Symmetry: C2
Subunit: 134 residues, 2 copies
DNA sequence: CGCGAATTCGCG
DNA sequence: CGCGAATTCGCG
């Protein structure tokens, strides 16, 4: 607002929602793929992007980066700030993996500090988030 | 739609919300007070109107009435149909009374049948619900 | 299509 | 003012 080009953009990829979910973190300016999560059979868009932002936080923290993270998801950003992923997705055998990851990402947020700013990507003005799965 | 005048209208009365709540059931056409609940120190508008509709159901069922009930509350009507009062109000010592009543009204709905239609009062067209506490 | 936040609605 | 449903929003 305007744009920190030297940043990490995190994206979620969803077929049906709920359904197969994956995510990745990319360099905002170049589009270089910095990390990617192999598809999880059942999750939601919001769960996936929550995990993406937390994966981003961890990736930047261990590399001592001052870089911010951009997400186009009001929801995932709010969940990260709250340290709580308020998903409606049922907890059952089929959803146990995503919920395990989510519960662990929440635990990470509850037990760590980070300086990374988490910024909203303004799709209407800046086009789509870098490397959007679309 | 239009109006069954021979009916029971149930109303909730609220100061602050949450705060002191009361309710009553009145004859729609005349305004005669058919039952009234003395003020409960802490509740919400929606909890109070839920209890009002269930009190109405019980009052009509035991008098073998075919009369419908009108409520202006989308929320309380939906909760009665679902047999579940989805209130956000915290459960603590101060709210224990209203929550006790609500939990018991839910149990009543889970263990009884009734033929009473529960109809939406159209305030925009028919003016305010009969004897509105306003 | 669905997921959830934000916003709008009707109410006392 | 707050309570919650319904609706609108942005997203993949």
């Amino acid at each position: 607002e305007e744009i920190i080009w030297e940043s990490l953009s995190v994206d979620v990829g969803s077929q049906g929602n709920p359904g197969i979910v994956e995510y990745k973190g990319v360099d905002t300016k170049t589009g270089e793929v910095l990390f990617e999560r192999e598809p999880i059979p059942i999750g939601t868009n919001n769960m996936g992007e929550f995990l993406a932002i937390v994966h981003g936080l961890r990736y930047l923290k261990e590399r001592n980066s001052r870089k911010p993270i951009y997400s186009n998801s009001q929801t995932a950003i709010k969940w990260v700030k709250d340290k709580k992923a308020k998903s409606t997705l049922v907890r059952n055998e089929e959803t146990a993996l995503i919920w395990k990851l989510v519960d662990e990402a929440e635990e990470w947020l509850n037990t760590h500090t980070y300086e990374t700013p988490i910024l909203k990507w303004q799709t209407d003005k800046w086009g789509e988030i870098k490397a959007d799965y679309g």
